[PDB]
């Protein structure tokens, strides 16, 4: 009953947002609730912020 | 990469089979954004065979879990190569060492 077939692929990209989950190497989970403009970031004597 | 290690990570990055290795030390003939060609050393070369390899690479492709796939060289051309070495790193690999 099948006569010929088509298939396709697109591409999609994804970038970061609150609610996206995060962690490292100790069970150290976490989720983002905010992303910070660099100005109100605390920072050092040398201005090299966090 | 990360910065603190344990040491095994090199020995991990290889036997996934995830990328090419130096089957036979030589020199790079040709390079592409998709592939490469080498000249095999004479001593490693056998008489009937010409002794050159091609390696055509893995570009953007999917898993069961359906994420990107790709491979690319960590190297240059017209340069010597020792056997067993790598040719190309992967989506999470770097100089024969994992980078996730």
């Amino acid at each position: 009953g099948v006569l010929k077939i088509v298939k396709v692929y697109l591409a999609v990209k994804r970038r970061i947002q609150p609610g996206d989950k995060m962690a490292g190497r100790h069970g150290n989970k976490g989720v983002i609730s905010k992303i910070n403009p660099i100005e109100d970031m605390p920072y050092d004597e040398n201005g090299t912020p966090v | 990469k990360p910065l603190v290690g344990t040491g095994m990570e090199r020995a991990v990055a290889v036997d996934s089979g995830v990328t090419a290795v130096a089957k036979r030390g030589g020199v790079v003939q040709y390079v592409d954004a998709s592939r490469i060609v080498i000249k095999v050393n004479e001593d490693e070369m056998y008489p009937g065979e010409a002794g050159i390899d091609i390696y055509n690479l893995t570009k953007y492709t999917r898993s069961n879990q359906n994420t990107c796939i790709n491979q690319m060289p960590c190297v240059s051309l017209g340069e010597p190569v020792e056997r067993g070495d790598v040719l190309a790193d992967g989506p999470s690999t770097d100089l024969g060492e994992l980078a996730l």
């Binding site: 609150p18 609610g19 996206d20 989950k21 989720v31 983002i32 609730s33 | -």
Partner: protein, 50 residues
């Protein structure tokens, strides 16, 4: 949806990604657009939604 914090918030308040309420409050809006008559009826209402 995934969840997170509002530190600023008060009691009665709650974060809401808006598409959620958007599609969830549709016939309110369709009665409301027929009422305004920008969308005189509901096909155009959904068009204008798009």
């Amino acid at each position: 949806s995934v969840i997170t914090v509002g530190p600023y918030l008060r009691l009665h308040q709650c974060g809401l990604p808006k598409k959620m309420a958007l599609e969830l409050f549709k016939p309110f809006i369709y009665g409301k657009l027929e009422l305004r008559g920008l969308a005189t009826t509901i096909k155009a209402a959904k068009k204008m939604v798009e």
